Design a protein around this ligand. Sequence first.
Ligand SMILES: [Zn+2]
Ligand SMILES: [Zn+2]
Ligand SMILES: [Zn+2]
Lengths: 88, 99, 82, 50, 60, 237
Amino acid sequence: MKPMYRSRSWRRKYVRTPGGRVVIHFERKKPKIAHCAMCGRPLNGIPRGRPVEMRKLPKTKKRPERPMPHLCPRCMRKVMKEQIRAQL
Amino acid sequence: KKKPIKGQSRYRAKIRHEQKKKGRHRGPGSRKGKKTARMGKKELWIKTIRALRKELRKLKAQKKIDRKTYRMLYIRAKGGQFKNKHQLYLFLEEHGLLK
Amino acid sequence: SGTKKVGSAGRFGARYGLKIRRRVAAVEAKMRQKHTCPVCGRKAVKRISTGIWQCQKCGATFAGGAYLPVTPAGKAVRRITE
Amino acid sequence: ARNKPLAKKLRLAKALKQNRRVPVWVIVKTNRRVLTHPKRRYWRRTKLKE
Amino acid sequence: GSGTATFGKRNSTPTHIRCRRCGRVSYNVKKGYCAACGFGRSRRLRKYRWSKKWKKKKNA
Amino acid sequence: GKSLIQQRRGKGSPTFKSPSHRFRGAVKYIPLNYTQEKTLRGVVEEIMHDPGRTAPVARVKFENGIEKLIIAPEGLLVGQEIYIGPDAPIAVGNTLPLAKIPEGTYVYNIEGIPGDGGKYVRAGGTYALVVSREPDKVIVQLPSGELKAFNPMCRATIGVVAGGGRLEKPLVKAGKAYYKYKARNKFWPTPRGVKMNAVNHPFGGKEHHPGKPTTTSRRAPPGRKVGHIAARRTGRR
RNA sequence: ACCCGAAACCGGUCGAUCUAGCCCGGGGCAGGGUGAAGUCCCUCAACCGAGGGAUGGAGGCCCGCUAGGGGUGCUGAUGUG
RNA sequence: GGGCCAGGGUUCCACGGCAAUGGUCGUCAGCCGUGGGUUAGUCGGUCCUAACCCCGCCCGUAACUCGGCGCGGGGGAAAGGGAAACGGGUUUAUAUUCCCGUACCGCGGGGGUAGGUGCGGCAACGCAAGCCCGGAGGGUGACGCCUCGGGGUAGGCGGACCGGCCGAUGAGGCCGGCUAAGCGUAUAAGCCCGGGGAGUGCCGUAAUGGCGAGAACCGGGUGAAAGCGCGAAUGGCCCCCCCGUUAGGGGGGUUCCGCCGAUCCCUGGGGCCCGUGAAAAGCCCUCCGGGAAUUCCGAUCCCCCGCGACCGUACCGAGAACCGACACAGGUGCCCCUGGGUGAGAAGCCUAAGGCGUGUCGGGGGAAACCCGGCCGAGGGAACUCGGCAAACUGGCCCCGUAACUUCGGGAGAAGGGGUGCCUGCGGGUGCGUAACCCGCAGGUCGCAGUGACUAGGGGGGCCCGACUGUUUAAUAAAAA
RNA sequence: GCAUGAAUGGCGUAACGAGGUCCCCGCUGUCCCCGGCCGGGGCCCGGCGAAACCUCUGCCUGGCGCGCAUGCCAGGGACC
Ligand SMILES: [Zn+2]
Ligand SMILES: [Zn+2]
Ligand SMILES: [Zn+2]
């Protein structure tokens, strides 16, 4: 196989085509899930994928519909309560 | 023309497999690997413990045993007292914990 | 798991000398225990890196000694400044 | 070898075109005086300068 | 070793390639300068009075 | 003859250069113009292991928006608040001018002159004792046991450097030593001059023994200063 | 200064595709054995304590014609190979 | 054997040839002569930055093409990061490039619509959920070593049934029974949300573990590899028939079940560091100000149209296409992959696919002596020799049983002893299973020999040196150095 | 102690070693004493086809001689 595909950054799958031939399919590994800014906890509502897959989706299908989507719900409530208490 | 493939035949292997299943070709003089290699170390324990846990949970669900005895049996199984659920049942029968 | 003397140094077999093995085993035995978390107060503290310790229960993390969460000089300082 | 810069490819092409025999009509015109030229090459034996 | 076997490890990148200035295969590709004319390192040509190749070129 | 390792180190070849790209960056104080006549509070964001530092480091985000790297003192807490300035409370992790630190306190990261950035007592498990406070100088006892005088406006941090006690545990393995010294690109393994060749070392020769006394004069030229340099005494006292 | 031959000395330049060292980015090492720390369990006595079985996978650990690497003896073959 | 770098540079394909080359011959060829052969928006360079390098200013130098810190700029990876394509067919030689079918990305354009001005959930969240410009923040890009659990897929095994071949037109054996990207679609682990209110504790894992700082137990959210449906049967494969001087034309199957299962993918635990295992472009989201929009503005949503430049693309990839002067038993490339049986095994042996008879001079022969590789050898068993050099003995697995010494971990597979095939049945483990893999018991029986081939340690007791693993004179010294 | 010795370290030391060294069981063609057999060369025939080297040549005994001669002296022998 080609030296570029000899690297482990590609994932290799042996696929048999309709004509009976055996070919090797290559593709890039998917990125990991997004994490909370503060506690570093996995987030929700943010699908995994490469930039092409992200651009394939609309805006509302990539983040939850609530303020501060970059924080987990616990941190979001923490920040909101702290902010309102400081304001009042 | 394209010649057909002279494929290798597995008749003798099939016959030997059937004979071994019956129990032949299995004596000490036909073993080359270690016994712990022929039967796994960790896999055997995994099978045993999972079977024991399944049996205990089945008994608890059927209500043949209460929570206290279920916990005690779970602790004993984790400790490794029972090498199989037959021994588990022997212990239960001896101690009269079945209902 | 039931060794008379070697303890944590049992990984070395019969190498590196009695003094070295004893010192290593003592240090690891004292290090690997669970320590009191300065924040939550429970014995759920583990060593994650040289001089960095983290509590397994409340998730706090602080800086301490290389092999112990607190050193004599550090505790003397804490006494001095209360 | 699989991936070649264009300039190197052009130089190899020039060497390939250079390598050929002396025309028979040229031999006749010179009256068997000109038979060979110094730039003949065998790929396995005489390598390119580059 | 040090002989025939070691001579088989010459399949790496060549040390010198063709030079855009003097036309010779002396351009150090890793260091980016020519060992014959000094192209890429000196504005003026690399000439030395103990060297006779530049005179050979013109039969001087 | 040939060169010595100490001579070759002076030419800065990759065999002797520090790989100052694996590290977390330089640890220096905020510019003195911010600290003087004004106290700032910063929040500790993370605590990290610097490959070559001998001590752990920490990131601090200040109120003004500056992110800085500091040497974390023992007991520092992530998310903790620290103060730098003249009006900061006396506590671990705070940086004060030397004139505002009560005598008998342990400090670290002392500036040689006001505003340089800190030069003294930065290794893990070290501290210095503030002995006296005078209008013209502040006396501080350093880890080596020397009483040095500092300008009163020099900045220092209270506490002790985390990561002390390393030398308690032996390295045991030549491989452990290999990784330790490779982390810093320090020359290892090391040869012996007595078993070197005469061309290579002053002590070299077929008979493995120095042919001359090993105490070398302080006036010796480069390529001759080996062994005990300007030694007042030798042996076991 | 009838002609030829030195080992050597000096100047300026060219080389780290071999090989030595270090930096950056990558690929690889069948199968089996032993069993460190840690975490436990069971039987009786209980003032003490004895007896038995598990789990766990550490190691510049072990065997190994896996791949790969090295080059001890035959002072074997060859030694205008 | 298959695929493909660097290097080679036409050695590639067809036809016509044998003066020379080829360790012999030659009608043959990597040879000679004559013609031809490399088709890209999707593959790679091109973009980003790493180690590092260069140029300008500046300082030094008699001086420079020389040495150099600090600023400003630029480069620097064909295996790091990084937009997008698969299958069938076609040529003598090219295929993700050419033709057919079906898709995707970037930019720009033309309609309609969501939104500007909208909703459902207590919640995690579900949503088409405004446009243009500038900025800030967060995420991803983005990462070490060891080890283990779970899900999946290649590949393999057994049975049934359609066709063909072999076989006695017996039994049985062998061959084929296939399915890409792209679209639509869900759960698993983790994490999270609402209810709930425990300890003479409870729950849980392979293991470590979790709980009033919120456990058992209920519902619910977000979440991978895969599978499924379209693609897609007219395609590929197997078979049969009419035509057969030649050239062609048609008709059928292409369906299931049960297992083992990866070093190939996805996802989580745990352990180790005096070792901490890259950066940037790019992409997504949120938030800040700024600019228009009302018979108006207008998409990350649906439909359609236009444009996507430059360079490489043949072939060997090595016991003859590279380096070593060679058609060199070396090196480079063991750089990526490996069906069946025995077996622990990617071992040894036999074999299927694939390849080859070119690790290239043939013929003759009791046709010797002698040399190199191999097998055996009566009685004795180191009497040989500087020295047991060389060879031989042991050898796998199960059971029993193991000494001096000791740093208590070891010595240790010490030493030493017994068994081992085949056949007829029983019993045990996990398992729904008489599926699959293992573990024992009884009996009968054959040989000189049952790890019958192959694979496959001989052992013990003293003394010197060096603690150990490791390194060394490439080409007479591997050692106590 | 011709002429050991405490960090150019002294002494001891379990485990480790293709390090040097001595002994015991067992094993054997190392040897007594060598003998058979197998394949590849050697040998013959058909082909391609060199090189190292080369003053000319080339029998002996006893002598002379730069003191150890195929070539000289006196003898012996010898078909190619
Ligand atoms: Zn959070
Ligand atoms: Zn805590
Ligand atoms: Zn040039």
